[PDB]
CSV table of C-alpha atoms in Angstrom, one decimal:
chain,number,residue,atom,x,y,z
A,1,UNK,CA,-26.5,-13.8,26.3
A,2,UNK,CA,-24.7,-11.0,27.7
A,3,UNK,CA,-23.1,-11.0,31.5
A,4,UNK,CA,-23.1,-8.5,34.6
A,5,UNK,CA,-19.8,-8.5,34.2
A,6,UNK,CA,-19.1,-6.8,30.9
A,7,UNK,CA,-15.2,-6.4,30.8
A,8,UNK,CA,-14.2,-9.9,31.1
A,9,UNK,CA,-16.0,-11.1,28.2
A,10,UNK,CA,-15.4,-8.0,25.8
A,11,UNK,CA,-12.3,-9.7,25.6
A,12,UNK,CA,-13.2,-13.8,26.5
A,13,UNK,CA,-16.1,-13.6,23.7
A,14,UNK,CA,-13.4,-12.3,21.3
A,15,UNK,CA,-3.6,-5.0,16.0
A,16,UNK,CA,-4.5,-1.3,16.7
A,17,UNK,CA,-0.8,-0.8,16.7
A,18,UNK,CA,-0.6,-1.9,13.6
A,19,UNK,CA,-3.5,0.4,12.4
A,20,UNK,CA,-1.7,3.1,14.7
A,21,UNK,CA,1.7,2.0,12.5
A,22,UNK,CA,0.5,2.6,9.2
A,23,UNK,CA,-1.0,5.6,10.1
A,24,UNK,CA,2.2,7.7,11.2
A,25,UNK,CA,4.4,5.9,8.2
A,26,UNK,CA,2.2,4.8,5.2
A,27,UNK,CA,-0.4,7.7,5.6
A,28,UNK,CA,2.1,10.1,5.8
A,29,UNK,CA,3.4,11.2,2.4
A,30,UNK,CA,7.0,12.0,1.1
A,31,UNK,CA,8.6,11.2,4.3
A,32,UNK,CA,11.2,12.1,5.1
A,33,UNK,CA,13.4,14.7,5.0
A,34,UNK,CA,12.1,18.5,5.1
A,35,UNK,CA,12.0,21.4,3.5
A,36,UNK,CA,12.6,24.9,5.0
A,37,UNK,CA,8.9,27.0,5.1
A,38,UNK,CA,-25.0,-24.3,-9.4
A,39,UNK,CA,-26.4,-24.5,-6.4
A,40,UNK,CA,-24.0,-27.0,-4.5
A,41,UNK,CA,-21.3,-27.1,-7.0
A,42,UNK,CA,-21.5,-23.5,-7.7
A,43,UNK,CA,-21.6,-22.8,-3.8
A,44,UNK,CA,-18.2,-25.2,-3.3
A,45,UNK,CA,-15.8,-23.6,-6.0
A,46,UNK,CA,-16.9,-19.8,-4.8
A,47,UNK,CA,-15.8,-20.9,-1.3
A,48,UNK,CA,-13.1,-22.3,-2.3
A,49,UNK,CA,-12.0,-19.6,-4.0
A,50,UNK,CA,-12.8,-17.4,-1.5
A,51,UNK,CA,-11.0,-19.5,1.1
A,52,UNK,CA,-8.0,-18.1,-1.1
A,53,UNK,CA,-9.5,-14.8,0.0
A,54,UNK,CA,-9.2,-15.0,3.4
A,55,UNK,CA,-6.5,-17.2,4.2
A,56,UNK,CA,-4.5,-14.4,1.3
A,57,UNK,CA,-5.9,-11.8,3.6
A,58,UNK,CA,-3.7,-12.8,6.5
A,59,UNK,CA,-0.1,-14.3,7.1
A,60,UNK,CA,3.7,-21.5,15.0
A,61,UNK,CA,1.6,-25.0,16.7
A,62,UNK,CA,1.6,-27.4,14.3
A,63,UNK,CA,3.7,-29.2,11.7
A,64,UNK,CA,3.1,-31.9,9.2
A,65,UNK,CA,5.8,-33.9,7.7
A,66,UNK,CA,3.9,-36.3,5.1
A,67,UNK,CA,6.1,-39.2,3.4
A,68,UNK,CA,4.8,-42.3,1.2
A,69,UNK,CA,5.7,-45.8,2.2
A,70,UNK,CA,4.6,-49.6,1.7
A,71,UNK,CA,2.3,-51.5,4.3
B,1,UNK,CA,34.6,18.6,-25.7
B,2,UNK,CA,38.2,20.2,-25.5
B,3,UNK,CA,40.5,23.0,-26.9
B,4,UNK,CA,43.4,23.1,-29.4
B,5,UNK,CA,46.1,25.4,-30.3
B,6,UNK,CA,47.3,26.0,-34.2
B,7,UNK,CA,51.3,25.1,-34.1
B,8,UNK,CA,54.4,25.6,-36.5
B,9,UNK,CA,57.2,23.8,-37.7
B,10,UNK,CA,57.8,19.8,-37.8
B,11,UNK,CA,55.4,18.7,-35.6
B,12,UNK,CA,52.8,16.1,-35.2
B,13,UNK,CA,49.4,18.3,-36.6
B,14,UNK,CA,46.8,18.5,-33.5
B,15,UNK,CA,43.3,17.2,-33.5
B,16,UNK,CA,41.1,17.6,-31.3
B,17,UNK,CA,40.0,15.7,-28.4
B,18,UNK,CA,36.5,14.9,-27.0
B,19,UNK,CA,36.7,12.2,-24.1
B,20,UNK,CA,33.7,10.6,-23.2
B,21,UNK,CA,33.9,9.6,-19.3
B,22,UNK,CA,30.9,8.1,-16.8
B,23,UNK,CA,30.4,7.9,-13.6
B,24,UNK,CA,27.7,5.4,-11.6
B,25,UNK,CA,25.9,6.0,-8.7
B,26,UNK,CA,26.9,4.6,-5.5
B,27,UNK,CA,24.4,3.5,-2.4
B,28,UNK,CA,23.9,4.3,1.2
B,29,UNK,CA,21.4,3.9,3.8
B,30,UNK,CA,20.3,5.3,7.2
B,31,UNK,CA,19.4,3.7,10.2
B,32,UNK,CA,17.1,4.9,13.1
B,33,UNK,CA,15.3,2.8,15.6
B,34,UNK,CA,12.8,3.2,18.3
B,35,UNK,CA,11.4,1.2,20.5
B,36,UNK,CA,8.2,-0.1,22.8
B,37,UNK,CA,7.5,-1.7,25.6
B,38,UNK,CA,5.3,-4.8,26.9
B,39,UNK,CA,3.3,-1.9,29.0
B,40,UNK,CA,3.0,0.3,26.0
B,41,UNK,CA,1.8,-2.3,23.5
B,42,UNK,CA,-0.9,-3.4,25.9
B,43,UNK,CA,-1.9,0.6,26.6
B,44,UNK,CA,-1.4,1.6,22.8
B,45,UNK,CA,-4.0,-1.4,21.8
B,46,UNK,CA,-6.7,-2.0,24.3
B,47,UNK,CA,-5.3,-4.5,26.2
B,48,UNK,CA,-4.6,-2.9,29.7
B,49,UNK,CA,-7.6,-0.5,29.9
């Protein structure tokens, strides 16, 4: 709940260049060149759903092969 | 579309001639490139602050 030491946990608790990237190219226009001058079953599928949202709002340490065989 | 001339004598008669050419666009590109560095990404973000 909070430390006497605030910077190392801003970033321990827890990119801009990116927001910095679009900014100069996407925000800028016409560039370039210039011119002169219900209640659990209904909870589970919206999560699931949704859990297309997030994981389709972004995008390395893992890797799973999966194969069938006999005992 | 093109011109003709009116001629005498034995002669094959003229008629006139349109041609119909067409050319198609070609493509090109330009490359520029800039770069960072390890010290810049961590200044332009808050990283090294």
């Amino acid at each position: 709940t909070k430390p006497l030491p605030t910077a190392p946990m801003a970033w321990a608790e827890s990119s801009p260049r990116e927001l910095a990237g679009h900014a100069p190219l996407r925000r800028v226009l016409r560039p370039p060149i210039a011119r002169r001058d219900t209640r659990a079953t209904r909870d589970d599928t919206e999560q699931a759903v949704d859990k297309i949202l997030r994981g389709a709002r972004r995008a390395p340490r893992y890797h799973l092969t999966r194969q069938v065989t006999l005992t | 579309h093109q011109p003709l001339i009116a001629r005498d004598g034995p002669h094959p008669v003229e008629q006139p001639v349109h041609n119909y050419m067409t050319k198609v666009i070609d493509r090109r590109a330009l490359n520029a490139a800039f770069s960072l560095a390890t010290e810049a990404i961590a200044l332009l973000t808050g990283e090294a602050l």
